[PDB]
Symmetry: C4
Subunit: 334 residues, 4 copies
């Protein structure tokens, strides 16, 4: 019986080999951006409303043409067999059962077609390959398999310098592979190539600059994820949560605006919503639950988050996520 997401981290730490825990937990450089994701959320306080009608409180949203049970999706995390033998299938099954979209990775350790076969609301995360033709074939595979959005990761021209992994000499075990296979920096031209080759909504993940958010809308993106990649890419990149309010104002409803980085409770989901987010992604906590107890662990995590989101919304006087978006916030200290 886990009562917070932090209960799951302790459990994952006990079970995982240190180098794998470090691959999961770590960030780039001095981990300044990793820590700042948490610091930034902790500075935000919500101004709750009272005495509103809560007879029909609902945490549901519509996003990319589909109902989701919560304003949340499972973030793309590569190589989930690192954490549990069932890997992506355990996570996707639990996500399906919870009514939460699951993001299938380019670097999944089970093939995208197998994960999509689980059902639910799968999205597909794209890393741009060596040549346009292979990238587009990967998008086509995902679309053919029933994925409902393409989450194009745009903050990885190359992978950041993760010093825990360098110090550990971390490498994939032989029993974990990139199952979609037997990369080059993306540009705005790559985005256009993807947009031209699919009817699915294209979601640009890793936007932090206001003008990049505007340009994403102009480029025909259906959404963006305001994100510093969990502090794993540029060390010193601003937390997404700190850019979110400015970005939401600038796009002025032109696309869905998601955020990630450090979401660790329903209260944090509420903060993100109050700052203007359509929805959040959650990464590391899902993997802690997977490591701790497989599919059942992820189910328990999603049930806990669902309860915390409903609790936070109602306590703040919000019968819907739309109402939560209209909450005001105040910045505090420590």
């Amino acid at each position: 019986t886990y009562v917070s997401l932090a209960d799951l981290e302790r459990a994952a730490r006990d079970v995982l080999p240190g180098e794998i825990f470090d691959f999961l937990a770590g960030g780039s450089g001095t981990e300044a951006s990793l820590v700042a994701n948490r610091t930034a959320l902790e500075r935000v306080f919500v101004i709750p409303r009272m005495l509103r009608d809560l007879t029909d409180v609902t945490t549901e949203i519509d996003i990319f043409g589909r109902r989701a049970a919560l304003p949340m999706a499972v973030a793309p995390v590569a190589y989930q067999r690192l954490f549990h033998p069932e890997g992506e299938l355990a996570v996707a099954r639990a996500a399906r059962d919870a009514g939460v979209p699951y993001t299938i990775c380019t670097l999944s350790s089970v093939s995208l077609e197998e994960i999509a076969a689980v059902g639910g609301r799968p999205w597909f995360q794209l890393f741009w390959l060596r040549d346009e033709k292979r990238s587009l074939d990967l998008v086509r595979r995902a679309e053919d398999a029933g994925c409902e959005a393409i989450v194009f990761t745009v903050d990885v021209p190359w992978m950041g310098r993760r010093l825990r992994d360098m110090r550990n000499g971390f490498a994939l075990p032989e029993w974990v592979t990139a199952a979609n296979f037997d990369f080059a920096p993306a540009t705005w031209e790559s985005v256009e190539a993807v947009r031209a080759h699919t009817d699915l909504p294209v979601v640009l993940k890793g936007i932090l600059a206001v003008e990049d958010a505007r340009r994403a809308v102009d480029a025909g993106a259906g959404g963006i994820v305001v994100s510093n990649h969990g502090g794993r890419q540029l060390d010193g990149a601003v937390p997404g949560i700190e850019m979110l309010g400015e970005i939401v104002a600038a796009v002025s409803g032109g696309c869905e605006v998601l955020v990630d980085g450090g979401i660790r409770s329903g209260g944090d989901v509420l903060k993100a919503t109050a700052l203007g987010a359509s929805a959040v992604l959650v990464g590391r906590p899902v993997m802690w639950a997977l490591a701790a107890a497989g599919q059942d662990g992820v189910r328990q995590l999603l049930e806990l988050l669902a309860e915390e989101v409903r609790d936070a919304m109602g306590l703040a006087g919000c019968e819907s996520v739309g109402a939560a978006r209209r909450l005001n916030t105040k910045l505090g200290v420590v």
Copy 2:
């Protein structure tokens, strides 16, 4: 001989069973709002005035048609028999003797009529019940027993997630019951039903949004308590002390504006007053005194607070609470 309110916490910790101490001390979630109540007060510095006439320094106020000895009332705290066998009677007696209003709880462990019989300035705190008729009968009982205000708690559509209590598996002992008995979310319609059924001032406890404060005045409230429920309801709710100045400006004398959360000295009372509060509520410290030494403990606490309030006022050049409200403040760090 206690010289600060913190002397009483140490004493209460020694005597109380851990799970009861945790029920008293704890907040919801990560306890961010609990801690922020203290942090926020610690950031406020007063700009004292010098060389004023202090020949007749008085800490008295008039509130809801009655003189009070200090700008303070005992906050509603449920189930006071948890802390001492005399429970609410010990606290109400000490409050009476000190000239401080005592708030009788809906969830009192001694009946409201017995506590009101003690005398003094009893107020009655309402939680909205299952149906209008039982709620209003509770208000009528309180009024018939001589309670002088109805403190309608508006920040509890349901109880928050107190993780200490969940981890402890905390439950009321068999010897503690809700003595007023053998709940549903309140709305603005509930407030109107209460206002229509009593001549007593209705005070809305748990207001944080400026527009909710304005609407409280428009709804015919005689007062509000600007409060995050001691960090026990929404984890991440702004501290009341941080909204107080804005709220005081917005209501512009249309109702009494009280504050609570983390008041732990006469200096803190002065800070609250300087930010515009009519009066404060004090919760946990009263219960520490009750646990430590029963009625005599609460008397000693109230005597200590009275001395600290008079000391702080005079040192700041204020011969009256009204003068303290005209003090300016400056925000600092740590």
Copy 3:
């Protein structure tokens, strides 16, 4: 060979009985204002100037018609025989030899006439007595003995609540007495009575509100000391250093504006000057030096401060204290 003022605190702690060290070190309440005096100085950074003429660097100022060797005076500290058998005579002698004004206390443990006989630039600090006539006789004694300013302490309607002293049960030893004798709250009328009865400059010590600074000028004060009494009076009073810039602007040269609280180096003196102070008072460090090594200890402290002030001024491109007052500052963190 002491290289910082902090070397002297360690030495004083070793030699003094704990309760006496606590009388010296302590503040009122939770010691929030005591700590904030240091925090506030630590937040201030100086913007030094380069490449100026430093051929004739001088730390001298003119204040209340007399040259002083540094922009500094010894603060009034009662009962200096607590710290060393020679008490006030040791401190006054060292101050004289260093060219620094010494403030003789109303509650001195050696008579004001004996201390004034030492020579140098004595000032006299007044606490307002029971009746106008005794207060004025004390002022007349000081003037007759050759004191050159009256430092009227205006932040002590009564003494603050020093919890270290209460916990220790601290009392003066039989061998320490108020040697000027065999009190009531001061008002603006008291200030006028003093101003009318002396040709000496009257300096109001303990001003924090901007309007009190203006009123001090209007009342005919020759100076003010912007001060929270070393955090010993109102716990939660703003540090003087945080009000200094606003106060300097408001009086616009109408009187001398001194500051105290937490000055612990020549760099701190420079910060105070850059914020607009005419001069600083230094309290506790002088007593650490007295406790550590008597008159010689105070001489060494004043020599160290003199070197640090000259060093800081020159490094900041200031050939005079007037130039230091024209330096700009920037607030930082921790």
Copy 4:
């Protein structure tokens, strides 16, 4: 295999005698400015750009008429034989091989002509001597030896009070001397004398005030280094990084604007660039590498920095240093 600059500090601490490590690490006074250099960098977050062309990422700049491989030069650090027997020759050789300018010190422990003979891009740092004629002869020597800029240090009218060195009784060993020999405060007249006597660009090191930056341009400086001398001069001097943005705006391209103090990674170089710096100087880390492993150590440090700079630039969407200068930043906490 060092993966961060902090790996080199640990290695230098192990090998160096404590008093030499302290000479290197220490600052003046309480070391407030030393610590603030790091604090200030840690507060800066970069807003990276995405999806830009990175086909030809280059870290090169042109400065003072010469290409440099990175926007970085080795700061002037006196007496490098303190740290390794090869001293300045080891550092200059590694700098040459890395394509980074090396600043030869007035107080070098190997003669300026020997160090310049190493080749590369040597600059020469000037301390103003006793008389104009010797100062100018030193400038002429440097110019004759092929130095390409004169870095006139302007923040040392005299040396600051380094308390670690005073406590240690630190003195140069007999085997370390000022090899350029067998000082007086600089002024603007000194700057003019230097500018009139050389065709080399004159760079004023130790500017913090905006008006001093403007006056440097008016005086014919080719550059400035915005710097508090690594917290070794005025204790309480603002960090250069905190003045940089204001200074860059004020000079509006009239000279090169460099910064130093606490640069410890390629991410920090990126922050400095984003705040408007043309280039940075790096001091202590170069000496840690020298102490740890001589010339090879410095080579490894410069290779690590080069990789971190390229990584940070690309992750932030910058194909050139000019692009990095156009990045925006956001201030955060801790």
